[PDB]
Amino acid sequence: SMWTEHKSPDGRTYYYNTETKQSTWEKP
Amino acid sequence: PPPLPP
Structure with a gap:
């Protein structure tokens, strides 16, 4: 739960957990 | 902004 959607500069789709x-x- | 994972 509690995640963020961002596109890695290299050209990938990464996510950041704002819960931990x-x-x-x-x-x- | 959030940091990218390794």
């Missing part, structure tokens, strides 16, 4: 404050790759 961590960075993750690909939809969880």
